[PDB]
Amino acid sequence: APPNLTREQAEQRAALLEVQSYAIELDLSAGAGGPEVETFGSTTTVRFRSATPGAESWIDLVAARVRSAVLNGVELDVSDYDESTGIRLPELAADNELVVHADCQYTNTGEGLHRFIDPVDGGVYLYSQFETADAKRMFTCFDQPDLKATYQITVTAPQDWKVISNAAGEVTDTGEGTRRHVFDTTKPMSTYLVALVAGPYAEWRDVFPGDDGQDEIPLGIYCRASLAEHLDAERLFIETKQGFGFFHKAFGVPYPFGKYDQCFVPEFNAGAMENAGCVTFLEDYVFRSRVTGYLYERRSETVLHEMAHMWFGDLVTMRWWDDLWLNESFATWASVLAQVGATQYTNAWTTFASVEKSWAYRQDQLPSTHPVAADIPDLQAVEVNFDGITYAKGASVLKQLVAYVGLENFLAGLKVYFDRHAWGNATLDDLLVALEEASGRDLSWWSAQWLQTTGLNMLRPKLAIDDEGRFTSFSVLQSPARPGAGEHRTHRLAIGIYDDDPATGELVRTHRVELDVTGERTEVPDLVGVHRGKLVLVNDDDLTYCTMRLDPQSLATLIDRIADIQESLPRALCWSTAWEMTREAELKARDFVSLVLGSSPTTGIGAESEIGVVQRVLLQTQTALASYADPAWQPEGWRRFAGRLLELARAAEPGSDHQLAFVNSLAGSVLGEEQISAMRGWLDGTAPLEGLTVDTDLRWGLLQALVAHGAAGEAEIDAELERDQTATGRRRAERARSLIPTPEAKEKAWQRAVHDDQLPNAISDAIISGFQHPGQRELLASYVRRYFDEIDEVWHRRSSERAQPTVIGLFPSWAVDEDTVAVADRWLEGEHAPALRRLVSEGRAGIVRALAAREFDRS
Ligand SMILES: [Zn+2]
């Protein structure tokens, strides 16, 4: 039970102490032994200064036992030691020295010095993970980011093992089964950035050739042995080299640490870690299969994300953890800049927009949303106060800060900031000021608008044109931020005009204006007299964080010309804007489906190069068919859609994501005779779609589609169960059982689902998962009113954790009716648990929204 350091405790210790250097010795000789090994030898010698001689302080440590601890000559009383209390340090001198001999535990969790035995070759692999505060599990330290120091690490290793750390080292053979690894003293670092990576790791090497004031850099890659066959080292070294050439130009600071080693470590909890000069990666980035291009891009971004930290995080580190959002956010942004600037992934801002940004917007519109910047009063707070929104929205708003300051200014203040604060600590405000100095902007209000609030502002353009089509006036209307306080933020955004390219007839940008948008209305005089083209795009370049609307004329053009938009970022914004206008009843549902389907499989989404956007659009199109479309037009809608899914898939590249995407969409769609015919053929080899590999997942999905339409019965599911029985498989089979279209099958599920008292929680969700379908609306009418009637008693019956998914999942979002809305209010009358009402409220709103759009579609 390690200590929950508080912001105050850290501030007080930071006030009093200044740490100079750490000397660490570790006995890892017993490490290559078997599971009975539980401890290792950690001897820490720390030199530090105190500015109130005679005061009492404390140093952090988490160990099995403490052999001895000797402050300034005196042997200290370790009899009472507990990890939650560390080591009190009374009678401090002005200059102190502490030596501590202890025995630390290896771990099997993510934290501290983690230990793993490869079940295949029996070899033992060690790695460390110290963020936020696990450094104390290896050595004695003041474990808080603002007491930086240099480290001199020496390890005694089994002789088969390599030992990688922050700095480069030298090895001398001990000839007793071991080797001794002495690593250079490092430059100053925080405790959680210290690395130790020890084992029989496969090892490559390469070097980034030095240039432009940047010295050469020794690079290496490591991974377990078994995994070494699948390591594309060549590729990784090219992407590492692209990054090092980019970042020192951009930042104006050469790589601060000596070499750059990157290790792929087993059982890694956190994906990647930016230990200085020793970056760690989870094993999923070692591609063991023919792998999709999105995975390469994602991996490329991840490598770049950690490399960025060398400067921002490792060279200048925060003071306390409430700047953790800024640290990761900046890195996220820097790595998309690098990808676009120096890698093959020149479409990176598009990916960012459809993946991280879209996700941020989705989260930020729910009632769960919270601001980026949270108060972090103690260490435990970090884990609960910063979540995905923090990071997804953090990156997106830092991108807008870059736009507002201006990129060249921003990069210019980065240099001031890295030089001003290098090998030291720094706050948000320390960086806002550097940026004020570089650009003359006033950012005193910025955090209060963007980091401390929630919700999105809408931007709608207000325009007028003359007989010639040239703007006579152009204003941007900003709406209050919702959900939230309702403030109007300040944006730097661009506006782009798109017109036919005479040579190709494709929509290309013919004009671009940038401006500060402020308050509830902003004028755009740079557009007066400019021809309005065919498409007017506010928030072009996706520089700001908002909800955008298209004018009526641009909207009409889009329906018939979206695939002709030459660039992917503008084309992705319109896919986004069209869906948001469908959600809000400004784009008729039927007209969104027409946007999506296009004239041909070569127009609309059939033409979208971007896999992320295709997936989202396909998913959103289904949602528009099931809920926003009008019942009269809906039967046709589904046929048109499943018709197009089928052609799109029978046209896509063979192992392509796009081909897979069209299959998976067809799977969840409502099908006609041919669709079922072809799909049935795909599970069999009767008529395989070429290149379409059918794994269990896809096979199960295809069957779930077959079974859901009556084309496949219980027997068909049952045999697939013989083909595969797994924890995942039972669930997958259970979902199929629930989908069969018969009241008896549904009746079984409601009771089994709602009422399986003794059913595993895995299975409950899988029983509900298949309980709904776009095409069984008639088959579910009974459960509309009964869910409301029943839920009360299950809420009182089941636990908090179990009950909420059942209410959310079985909420009758399939019945979009005034009747069902009326029933929601009817249920709403009786007093019920606030948490139960909390769900019915979210749930009811979805039905209401769907009904207003159902209506606009009729309009
Ligand atoms: Zn990060």
PDB file of C-alpha atoms in Angstrom, residues 738 746 749-755 764-765 767-772 780 783-788 790-791 794 802-815 839 847:
ATOM      1  CA  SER A 738     -31.119 -13.911 -29.269  1.00  0.00           C
ATOM      2  CA  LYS A 746     -37.307 -13.033 -27.990  1.00  0.00           C
ATOM      3  CA  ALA A 749     -34.194 -13.672 -24.194  1.00  0.00           C
ATOM      4  CA  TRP A 750     -36.152 -11.040 -22.243  1.00  0.00           C
ATOM      5  CA  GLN A 751     -36.435 -13.374 -19.334  1.00  0.00           C
ATOM      6  CA  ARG A 752     -33.076 -15.018 -19.708  1.00  0.00           C
ATOM      7  CA  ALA A 753     -31.523 -11.666 -20.325  1.00  0.00           C
ATOM      8  CA  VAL A 754     -33.219  -9.541 -17.781  1.00  0.00           C
ATOM      9  CA  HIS A 755     -33.650 -12.382 -15.353  1.00  0.00           C
ATOM     10  CA  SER A 764     -26.023 -11.021 -20.084  1.00  0.00           C
ATOM     11  CA  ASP A 765     -24.715  -8.404 -22.468  1.00  0.00           C
ATOM     12  CA  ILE A 767     -28.012 -11.876 -24.792  1.00  0.00           C
ATOM     13  CA  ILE A 768     -29.102  -8.305 -25.092  1.00  0.00           C
ATOM     14  CA  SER A 769     -26.637  -7.403 -27.742  1.00  0.00           C
ATOM     15  CA  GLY A 770     -28.487  -9.679 -30.145  1.00  0.00           C
ATOM     16  CA  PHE A 771     -31.918  -8.794 -28.753  1.00  0.00           C
ATOM     17  CA  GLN A 772     -32.200  -5.735 -31.023  1.00  0.00           C
ATOM     18  CA  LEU A 780     -40.194  -6.000 -30.434  1.00  0.00           C
ATOM     19  CA  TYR A 783     -41.080  -5.046 -24.981  1.00  0.00           C
ATOM     20  CA  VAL A 784     -41.600  -1.278 -25.417  1.00  0.00           C
ATOM     21  CA  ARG A 785     -43.970  -0.736 -22.488  1.00  0.00           C
ATOM     22  CA  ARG A 786     -42.751  -3.743 -20.524  1.00  0.00           C
ATOM     23  CA  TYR A 787     -39.168  -2.505 -20.244  1.00  0.00           C
ATOM     24  CA  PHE A 788     -40.535   0.466 -18.389  1.00  0.00           C
ATOM     25  CA  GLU A 790     -40.038  -4.137 -15.437  1.00  0.00           C
ATOM     26  CA  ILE A 791     -37.009  -1.927 -15.009  1.00  0.00           C
ATOM     27  CA  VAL A 794     -34.594  -4.931 -11.627  1.00  0.00           C
ATOM     28  CA  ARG A 802     -25.131  -4.860 -13.386  1.00  0.00           C
ATOM     29  CA  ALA A 803     -28.347  -2.842 -13.633  1.00  0.00           C
ATOM     30  CA  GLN A 804     -27.193   0.137 -15.764  1.00  0.00           C
ATOM     31  CA  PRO A 805     -26.123  -1.863 -18.876  1.00  0.00           C
ATOM     32  CA  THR A 806     -29.410  -3.816 -18.785  1.00  0.00           C
ATOM     33  CA  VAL A 807     -31.478  -0.607 -18.650  1.00  0.00           C
ATOM     34  CA  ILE A 808     -29.301   1.147 -21.275  1.00  0.00           C
ATOM     35  CA  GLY A 809     -29.171  -1.872 -23.585  1.00  0.00           C
ATOM     36  CA  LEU A 810     -32.806  -2.840 -23.391  1.00  0.00           C
ATOM     37  CA  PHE A 811     -34.036   0.694 -23.532  1.00  0.00           C
ATOM     38  CA  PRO A 812     -36.446   0.722 -26.349  1.00  0.00           C
ATOM     39  CA  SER A 813     -34.615   2.969 -28.756  1.00  0.00           C
ATOM     40  CA  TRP A 814     -35.943   0.767 -31.459  1.00  0.00           C
ATOM     41  CA  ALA A 815     -39.408   2.093 -31.052  1.00  0.00           C
ATOM     42  CA  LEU A 839     -30.856   6.653 -17.665  1.00  0.00           C
ATOM     43  CA  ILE A 847     -36.180   9.030 -28.848  1.00  0.00           C
TER      44      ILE A 847
END
